Amino acid sequence: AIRKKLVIVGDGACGKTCLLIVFSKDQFPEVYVPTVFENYVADIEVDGKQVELALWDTAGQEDYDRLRPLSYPDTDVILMCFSIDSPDSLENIPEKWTPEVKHFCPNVPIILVGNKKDLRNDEHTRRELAKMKQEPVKPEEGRDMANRIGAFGYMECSAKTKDGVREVFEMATRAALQA
């Protein structure tokens, strides 16, 4: 089992902390959803290869441009997150996050992940976004952004229902193992 490091980046409302919590427990918390995530080392076997995947969150570092890059050294795979209930979080992907990750993590694969996919057809979400002349991110808009930014791939998931969560981290592990 070789050790690899994963870092998740994205806006404060993208759901990155929840995603790490749900993956690390294989469960959406039933009693208390933690506010923060410290770190975790997941044992993952993907395509016959055993990896210890260290997981890190950048939540709380968004406003601190000198502290935030301290999370990046020796990263093997980046999860770059946006929320499907927030077109504003998707707009910040090519503007701020992509040039930052390309500078501090040169040649590290980036997987663009659309979080909260369960809200795409949520009536309350659709009514709320319509007031700002917006709508939930469509899958083709996510794929196009991933293509434009040079992402390794595009994936979607729901931390609430767990759908797609295992697949995201197994693919991140495969990306981390590539030359």
Binding site: P29, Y32, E38, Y40, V41, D57, Y64, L67, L70, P73
Partner: protein, 245 residues
């Protein structure tokens, strides 16, 4: 950590730590507030434990078993004794507030109603000046520590054997040298998230809402000062590279 504190913070939440008969006596909003305060103290206990692994297991183990050149152990673990003193003191105040709040006859049933004042004290005056000075120094030495660690692990046989030996136990899985350094760097930016969520459930007493509002502002001021005071040190970087920053 010591067994008494580990057991007091073993449960995933305050609502699972207290007796179910005690939990039933409180309003829903009080349970929400207490669950987030319990997460702040639980994560602070783990952060002090990370610093104890750095000072006692790694730093002191390297001094007592290895023949490293002078200034090498300090380079790997910059400011660790100062960081341990700051957070062991803060943890002591949090645990004493919990202990005073316990019901007579219980070692687990309590409610903390006055956290704001403790956070104002921690994040103002001389203790905030010491946190700012220590994190500005530590975070500016972060790249240098990681680079020194990698060089020693790749070239010194006795150093590699020592690291593999002390990090082999399952309880050290998340706590290798580089992992400890980043856990410490990331600790200060967890505070606003935790304080804001405690504040969200502390409107019941206006003086408490005001005190947590003041504490959140003080923590953000400290983070802004630390962030503006960082410049990565680099071994071998020439003066010309520095004054041309």
């Amino acid at each position: 950590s010591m067994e008494m504190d580990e057991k007091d913070f073993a449960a995933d939440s305050w609502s699972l730590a207290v007796d179910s008969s005690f939990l039933q006596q409180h309003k829903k909003e009080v349970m929400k507030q207490q669950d987030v305060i319990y997460e702040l103290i639980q994560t602070e206990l783990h952060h002090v434990r990370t610093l104890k692994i750095m000072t006692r297991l790694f730093r002191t183990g390297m001094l007592e078993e290895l023949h490293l050149e002078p200034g090498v152990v300090q380079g790997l673990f910059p400011c660790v004794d100062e960081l341990s003193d700051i957070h062991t003191r803060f943890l002591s105040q949090l645990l004493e507030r919990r202990r005073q709040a316990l019901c007579p006859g219980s070692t687990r049933n309590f409610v903390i109603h006055r956290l704001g004042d403790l956070l104002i004290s921690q994040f103002s005056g001389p203790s905030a000046e010491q946190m700012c000075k220590t994190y500005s120094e530590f975070c500016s030495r972060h790249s240098k520590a990681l680079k020194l660690y990698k060089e020693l692990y790749a070239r010194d046989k006795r150093f590699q054997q020592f690291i593999r030996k002390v990090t082999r136990p399952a309880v050290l899985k998340r706590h290798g040298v580089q992992e400890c350094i980043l856990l410490v760097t990331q600790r200060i930016t967890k505070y606003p998230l935790l304080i804001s969520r405690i504040l969200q459930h502390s409107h019941g007493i206006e003086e408490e809402r005001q005190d947590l509002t003041t504490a959140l502002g003080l923590v953000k001021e400290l983070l802004s000062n630390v962030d503006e005071g960082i410049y990565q040190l680099e071994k071998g970087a020439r003066l010309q590279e520095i004054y041309n920053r």
